[PDB]
Amino acid sequence: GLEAKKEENLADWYSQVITKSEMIEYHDISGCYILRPWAYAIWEAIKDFFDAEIKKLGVENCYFPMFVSQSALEKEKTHVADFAPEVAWVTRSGKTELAEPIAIRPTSETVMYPAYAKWVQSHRDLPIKLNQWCNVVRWEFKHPQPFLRTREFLWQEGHSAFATMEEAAEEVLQILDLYAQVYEELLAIPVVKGRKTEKEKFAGGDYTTTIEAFISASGRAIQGGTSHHLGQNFSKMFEIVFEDPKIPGEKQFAYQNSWGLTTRTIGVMTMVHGDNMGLVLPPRVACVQVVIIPCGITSEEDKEALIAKCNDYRRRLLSVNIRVRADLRDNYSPGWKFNHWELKGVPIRLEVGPRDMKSCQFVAVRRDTGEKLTVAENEAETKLQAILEDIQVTLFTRASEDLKTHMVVANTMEDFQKILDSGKIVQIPFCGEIDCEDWIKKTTARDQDLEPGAPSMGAKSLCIPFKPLCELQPGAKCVCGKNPAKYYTLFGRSY
Amino acid sequence: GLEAKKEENLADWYSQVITKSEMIEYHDISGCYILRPWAYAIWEAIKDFFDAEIKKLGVENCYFPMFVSQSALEKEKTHVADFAPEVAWVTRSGKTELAEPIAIRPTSETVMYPAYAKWVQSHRDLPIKLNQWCNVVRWEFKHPQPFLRTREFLWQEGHSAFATMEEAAEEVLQILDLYAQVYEELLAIPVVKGRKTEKEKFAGGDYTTTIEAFISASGRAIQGGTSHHLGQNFSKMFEIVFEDPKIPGEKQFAYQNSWGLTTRTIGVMTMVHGDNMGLVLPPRVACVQVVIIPCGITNALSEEDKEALIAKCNDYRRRLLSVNIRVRADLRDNYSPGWKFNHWELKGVPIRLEVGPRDMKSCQFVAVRRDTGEKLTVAENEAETKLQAILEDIQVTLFTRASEDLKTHMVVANTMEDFQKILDSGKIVQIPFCGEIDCEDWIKKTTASMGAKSLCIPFKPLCELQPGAKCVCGKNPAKYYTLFGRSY
Ligand SMILES: Cc1cc(N2CC[C@@](C#N)(C3CC3)C2=O)cc(NC(=O)Cc2ccccc2)n1
Ligand SMILES: Cc1cc(N2CC[C@@](C#N)(C3CC3)C2=O)cc(NC(=O)Cc2ccccc2)n1
Ligand code: PRO
Ligand code: PRO
Ligand SMILES: [Ca+2]
Ligand SMILES: [Ca+2]
Ligand SMILES: [Ca+2]
Ligand SMILES: [Ca+2]
Ligand SMILES: [Ca+2]
Ligand SMILES: [Ca+2]
Ligand SMILES: [Ca+2]
Ligand SMILES: [Ca+2]
Ligand SMILES: [Ca+2]
Ligand SMILES: [Cl-]
Ligand SMILES: [Zn+2]
Ligand SMILES: [Zn+2]
Numbered sequence: 001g002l003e004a005k006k007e008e009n010l011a012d013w014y015s016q017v018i019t020k021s022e023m024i025e026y027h028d029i030s031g032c033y034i035l036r037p038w039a040y041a042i043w044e045a046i047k048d049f050f051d052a053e054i055k056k057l058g059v060e061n062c063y064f065p066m067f068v069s070q071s072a073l074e075k076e077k078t079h080v081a082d083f084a085p086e087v088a089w090v091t092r093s094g095k096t097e098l099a100e101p102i103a104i105r106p107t108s109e110t111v112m113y114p115a116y117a118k119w120v121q122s123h124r125d126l127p128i129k130l131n132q133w134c135n136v137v138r139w140e141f142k143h144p145q146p147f148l149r150t151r152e153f154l155w156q157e158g159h160s161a162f163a164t165m166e167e168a169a170e171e172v173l174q175i176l177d178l179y180a181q182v183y184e185e186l187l188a189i190p191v192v193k194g195r196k197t198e199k200e201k202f203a204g205g206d207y208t209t210t211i212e213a214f215i216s217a218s219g220r221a222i223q224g225g226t227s228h229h230l231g232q233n234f235s236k237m238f239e240i241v242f243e244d245p246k247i248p249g250e251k252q253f254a255y256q257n258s259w260g261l262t263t264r265t266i267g268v269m270t271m272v273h274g275d276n277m278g279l280v281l282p283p284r285v286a287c288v289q290v291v292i293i294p295c296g297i298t299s300e301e302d303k304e305a306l307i308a309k310c311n312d313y314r315r316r317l318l319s320v321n322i323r324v325r326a327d328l329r330d331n332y333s334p335g336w337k338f339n340h341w342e343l344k345g346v347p348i349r350l351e352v353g354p355r356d357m358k359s360c361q362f363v364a365v366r367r368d369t370g371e372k373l374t375v376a377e378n379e380a381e382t383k384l385q386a387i388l389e390d391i392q393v394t395l396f397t398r399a400s401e402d403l404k405t406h407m408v409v410a411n412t413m414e415d416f417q418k419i420l421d422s423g424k425i426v427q428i429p430f431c432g433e434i435d436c437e438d439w440i441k442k443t444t445a446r447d448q449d450l451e452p453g454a455p456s457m458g459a460k461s462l463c464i465p466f467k468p469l470c471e472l473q474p475g476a477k478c479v480c481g482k483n484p485a486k487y488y489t490l491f492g493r494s495y
Numbered sequence: 496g497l498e499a500k501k502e503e504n505l506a507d508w509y510s511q512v513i514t515k516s517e518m519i520e521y522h523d524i525s526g527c528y529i530l531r532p533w534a535y536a537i538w539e540a541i542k543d544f545f546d547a548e549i550k551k552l553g554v555e556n557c558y559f560p561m562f563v564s565q566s567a568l569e570k571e572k573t574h575v576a577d578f579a580p581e582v583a584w585v586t587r588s589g590k591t592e593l594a595e596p597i598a599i600r601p602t603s604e605t606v607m608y609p610a611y612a613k614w615v616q617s618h619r620d621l622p623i624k625l626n627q628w629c630n631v632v633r634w635e636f637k638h639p640q641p642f643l644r645t646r647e648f649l650w651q652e653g654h655s656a657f658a659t660m661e662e663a664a665e666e667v668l669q670i671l672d673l674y675a676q677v678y679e680e681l682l683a684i685p686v687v688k689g690r691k692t693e694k695e696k697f698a699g700g701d702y703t704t705t706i707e708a709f710i711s712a713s714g715r716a717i718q719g720g721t722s723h724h725l726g727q728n729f730s731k732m733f734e735i736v737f738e739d740p741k742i743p744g745e746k747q748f749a750y751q752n753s754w755g756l757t758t759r760t761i762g763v764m765t766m767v768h769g770d771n772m773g774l775v776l777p778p779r780v781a782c783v784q785v786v787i788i789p790c791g792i793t794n795a796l797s798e799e800d801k802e803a804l805i806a807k808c809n810d811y812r813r814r815l816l817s818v819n820i821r822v823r824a825d826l827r828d829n830y831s832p833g834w835k836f837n838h839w840e841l842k843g844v845p846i847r848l849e850v851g852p853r854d855m856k857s858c859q860f861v862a863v864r865r866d867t868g869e870k871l872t873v874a875e876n877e878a879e880t881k882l883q884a885i886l887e888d889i890q891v892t893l894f895t896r897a898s899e900d901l902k903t904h905m906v907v908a909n910t911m912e913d914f915q916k917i918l919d920s921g922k923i924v925q926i927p928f929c930g931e932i933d934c935e936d937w938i939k940k941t942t943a944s945m946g947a948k949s950l951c952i953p954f955k956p957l958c959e960l961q962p963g964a965k966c967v968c969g970k971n972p973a974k975y976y977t978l979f980g981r982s983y
Binding site for chain 2: 025027028029032033034035036037040041043044060061062063064065066067069071072084085086087088089090091092093094095096102104111114115118119124130134135137139141152154329331
């Protein structure tokens with residue numbers, strides 16, 4: 001049974017939920033977590049969708065080494081200046097010192113782009129569109145959080161190289177739209193699409209696009225995924241050059257993107273939809289969508305028939321592409337099974353007892369609302385499908401409502417401060433400068449009016465939304481007062 | 496095309512094939528290699544099959560950390576002694592030296608089994624059946640070789656814990672049989688199932704089962720996959736215990752297996768089926784089974800005819816997709832037909848489907864099998880039936896050829912001079928063997944090129960060991976026929 005309450009101690013609730021749902025186990029090293037099957041299956045559902053979608057775009061999967069040489073790691077100055085403090089270094093094998101230290105990838109731009117340089121000789125060798133599913137290591141000494149912010153994590157990183165800026169620009173937004181589909185259609189989490197500010201953009205990149213999710217339980221926002229246009233910044237450093245004989249002699253540098261998505265998805269899903277009974281799985285990613293549990297059973301051969309009827313429902317659901325398990329163990333009581341599968345967030349519990357079997361009916365119990373329904377055996381495939389779809393809509397609708405009551409506009413620093421301290425994220429007119437962003441962080445921390453159990457921190461930028469709530473009026477001032485605003489920018493306390 | 500010849504410098508042939516088929520690229524860290532999409536797709540076909548099969552056995556996928564602490568790594572002393580010289584160690588982040596060095600997994604027993612000990616708190620928590628698809632590092636300084644022997648490689652590693660030895664022993668063999676299915680049904684590679692000798696078995700395990708494949712062109716054998724029974728060696732160290740259901744208070748240690756299969760699969764496929772034209776893909780793992788190539792698109796051909804040709808190609812494409820044939824239509828106009836013939840030949844695509852304007856106007860096409868190079872003219876209306884047949888025949892042919900090779904090069908010998916002769920003729924030999932470690936080192940020393948090593952004790956030997964037969968050492972009696980050879 002779950003006893004930690006989400007609105008009381010969020011961090012302890014989160015830890016109880018991810019362990020009792022059998023999603024996470026703690027490793028004997030700090031910041032290292034084990035993905036047990038219940039969580040890994042969500043990642044695999046995400047993988048299946050995104051893999052199919054990028055393959056439609058011409059992207060192919062591959063696998064590049066996990067190690068970088070010091071020489072390659074340092075060829076793009078901005079990139080390495082940003083990643084160097086958290087790059088983990090292998091310096092020996094057994095007791096034998098290595099030829100030279102080699103680094104574990106924090107990201108694979110510097111692993112992959114020397115090979116791209118070899119592969120690009122003429123204009124027809126482009127585009128190059130590669131993806132890999134792998135682990136990366138970002139060894140920060142700040143406090144880790146399972147799924148949300150870890151030293152090692154699973155992800156996918158896509159890397160594409162084009163002869164023209166137009167093709168690259170097109171791909172950046174296509175990928176970002178796929179990440180939005182992952183969050184909104186699979187995980188039932190609404191997100192805000194936008195551009196990262198100058199301060200927050202990928203070091204070494206031209207510009208970074210992003211999707212941002214809002215976690216109302218902490219009132220904080222978090223980046224769900226990211227799609228960068230790298231311009232020619234890496235092609236010039238790694239010599240990814242072609243010669244088009246229609247532009248004789250002139251070396252031409254490829255235009256590049258990289259884009260990434262991680263198992264942070266599963267953490268956001270946990271934080272958004274979880275409740276005080278435990279995890280709540282959107283049916284689109286649930287490892288088990290329907291769990292069948294036999295009740296009653298306090299007369300043999302009926303008990304033998306009851307088990308048979310549970311397996312009948314199981315086969316009927318398997319036949320219609322509903323993912324189903326029959327918890328037929330006798331080693332545990334029906335109540336223990338109810339609790340076990342509620343903790344795990346199974347969308348529907350299918351209860352079968354003797355009376356209902358002899359009456360050609362069953363009971364379906366929805367996990368999002370607890371609502372109980374009696375269904376005729378004949379309708380099992382239809383109604384369950386309906387309920388599954390309805391659950392997915394409900395989860396999304398609720399999450400959407402929370403986002404829209406918690407994201408509002410403010411046009412002055414004082415209104416921004418007050419709204420922010422009330423637990424919301426705010427679209428403000430913004431001049432765009434890094435220095436002004438720093439000042440916003442510092443002063444929104446300095447001026448914070450604390451609300452009970454609210455996070456103590458300054459506001460950061462989240463994204464410049466593609467579709468802001470309001471149109472920037474002509475000659476509007478930034479909240480800094482001294483510069484004209486360039487755009488509405490979403491700000492909030494964030495992970 | 497391809498210039499280096501397989502029967503000459505095998506290593507240069509191998510290098511040329513793996514790069515010109517766009518399977519491998521060299522990384523700037525000597526000894527590490529890039530798996531380009533042509534190779535990765537083979538790995539993905541193998542994963543699709545194996546994943547489905549083990550999920551039928553109750554096994555579930557997970558992901559454990561890449562890092563091991565010094566204390567967990569050394570708890571099973573045999574295992575750590577075997578792996579310690581090739582464990583890679585992280586000693587700093589940025590410029591900050593780490594407080595304690597952390598190891599990268601060479602294999603995940605010592606990462607997973609503390610968690611297993613936490614998860615088993617009664618007999619009902621068993622069995623535990625977990626698998627992960629991931630990368631491991633074994634940083635030897637020997638000479639690496641793409642696919643076959645690398646410092647970093649992708650694999651799958653399965654780890655199961657049971658209450659009784661009978662369950663564990665059953666799973667060891669089920670997994671070994673799936674590995675043999677990967678090699679024989681998917682990769683068209685015959686293998687020999689057997690048991691490793693005491694000398695060659697997994698350090699810290701009780702016994703190791705294996706499949707061994709034979710590479711005609713080198714005379715050498717290579718281990719394809721392995722399935723180990725760890726017994727209670729690891730559960731005694733990591734305290735994986737449950738209470739006896741019948742005896743109150745009595746704790747019992749779980750029985751464990753682990754089993755692994757790597758991208759070495761691809762290397763063996765390349766070495767067994769490749770020829771002097773390049774890679775040769777078995778249809779069951781070929782990303783592209785049929786490639787459609789328009790020919791004859793000269794300057795004289797009308798726009799009417801050229802667009803009709805392209806549409807004919809797309810219609811073959813649709814038809815082959817409708818019958819589940821993995822087909823690529825290569826309609827690019829900025830590459831010549833000959834370039835495409837060569838490109839897809841080097842990549843080992845099973846069938847090239849040629850359509851020119853005259854063939855379209857004759858309601859037929861040309862299909863060229865990669866393995867034999869035979870050109871067949873096929874009527875349009877039979878495309879789906881014939882190509883399917885040919886794909887099956889290709890898979891059968893590749894297996895039959897390789898099986899003939901194995902039968903040719905795996906013979907029995909009962910004397911040591913006979914063993915030495917057959918071994919230096921480029922074969923592997925089943926010999927009467929006493930099993931002793933010292934005598935295995937002795938065979939290695941005497942047979943040295945290099946000395947032969949133990950490969951497997953075959954489940955099904957070629958000969959019944961005649962009662963009272965003496966080992967090849969001529970000192971102690973033989974316990975079993977053992978396969979020996981020069982090994983990868
Ligand atoms: C789980 C996860 C996710 C992500 N990040 C990053 C942005 C991104 C997005 N979008 C990446 C592009 C894909 C993302 O998901 C980042 C991380 N660790 C870290 O920063 C390192 C660390 C470790 C412990 C504590 C604090 C920091 N850990
Ligand atoms: C690609 C691959 C495969 C395998 N091994 C092992 C046995 C096994 C089987 N069966 C594994 C249990 C599954 C296998 O495939 C082993 C390896 N590297 C190494 O030993 C490290 C190395 C590196 C350079 C030179 C020499 C040695 N590299
Ligand atoms: O780390 C990043 O954000 C980019 C996207 C994936 C690859 N590198
Ligand atoms: O390395 C090995 O041989 C065993 C089997 C896979 C995991 N550990
Ligand atoms: Ca599962
Ligand atoms: Ca950093
Ligand atoms: Ca620009
Ligand atoms: Ca110029
Ligand atoms: Ca207050
Ligand atoms: Ca491919
Ligand atoms: Ca060793
Ligand atoms: Ca005792
Ligand atoms: Ca004809
Ligand atoms: Cl056998
Ligand atoms: Zn400003
Ligand atoms: Zn002997």
